[PDB]
Amino acid sequence: PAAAPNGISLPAGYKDWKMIGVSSRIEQNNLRAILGNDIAVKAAREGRTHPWPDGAILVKLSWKKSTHELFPSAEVPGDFTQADFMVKDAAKYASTGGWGYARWLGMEQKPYGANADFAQECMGCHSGAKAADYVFTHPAKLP
Amino acid sequence: PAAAPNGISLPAGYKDWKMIGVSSRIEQNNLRAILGNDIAVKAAREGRTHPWPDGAILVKLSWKKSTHELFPSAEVPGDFTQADFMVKDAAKYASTGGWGYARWLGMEQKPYGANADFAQECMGCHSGAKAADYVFTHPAKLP
Ligand code: HEC
Ligand code: HEC
Structure with missing residues (x-):
């Protein structure tokens, strides 16, 4: 797909990456x-x-919640909504906390953002996680 | 870890496997x-x-839900509860629908089940998915 407005290209092969965690946004x-x-x-x-x-x-993949047709208390992915990326490069992305932000929307992979300054939106919330290097996710515990 | 009561050994390296989907069990x-x-x-x-x-x-990994300390509408993993496996071998596990079922509990990874017939409990629900080869999960759609 097209690059984000800040020049970040979609990382190839993200669907094959290993899992860090899961979430539900109410x-x-x-x-x-x-x-x-x-x-x-x-x-x-x-x-x-x-x-x-x-x-x-880091990539966050989001789907709309749907309920499983055979088991109604199981909420499961429906339509794919977006892929959110954060790329760490302390020098390159110093103006946005050392992270390069990028989002692509939908199965059509349309880049998000009006202009190259779009990542300030992302920073608006992610600055609340400054003590954790701007990352909210706590890696899920596994044996 | 100890083998399951039906003889299935814990698959090594599962935490490095690729994602099929995610769910929330209400x-x-x-x-x-x-x-x-x-x-x-x-x-x-x-x-x-x-x-x-x-x-x-297939492996399902389960964690207790917990709310994020910085963003309370985000439900995120807490304590790890269990790893559920299904191993396909149509001939070997013909008596349980062609799948070897196994569960390990907690960080301590205690095998589940009173005896070698424990997989009948798993079949009790998974038989509702018989038309889909005893698998509920629909792979999440990605571009
Ligand atoms: C999750 C996120 C991830 C994963 C890394 C992380 O910080 O955990 C990426 C790559 C990313 N975001 Fe952000 N985001 C927010 C919260 C609370 C979480 C964790 C809970 C969950 O799994 O959903 C996030 C919050 C916000 C937010 C507050 C309303 C905004 C405006 C944004 N995020 C915006 C962005 C981006 C701007 C386009 C962007 C590329 C993000 N997030 C990336
Ligand atoms: C998920 C499961 C998975 C993933 C494969 C699949 O069928 O989707 C494994 C490996 C597994 N189970 Fe099962 N299970 C149930 C449901 C509705 C889902 C999909 C929704 C979700 O993500 O949670 C499952 C339902 C049940 C159930 C009904 C009360 C029981 C009793 C069981 N499952 C039991 C077992 C096992 C017995 C020890 C076992 C190894 C399972 N499930 C494996």
């Missing part, structure tokens, strides 16, 4: 998966998040 | 990730699920 009626590239997954598992290392890429 | 207050080995992932993506191919392994 207020938007979605389910999400949080994946990362191998730098991000190694950092997440080792607790090297203060700060995250350069080269880490 | 009645359990759990968030879940569904991963699969590469045989399962290929089959899921290609629609070769009638029946699933031998060697496919």
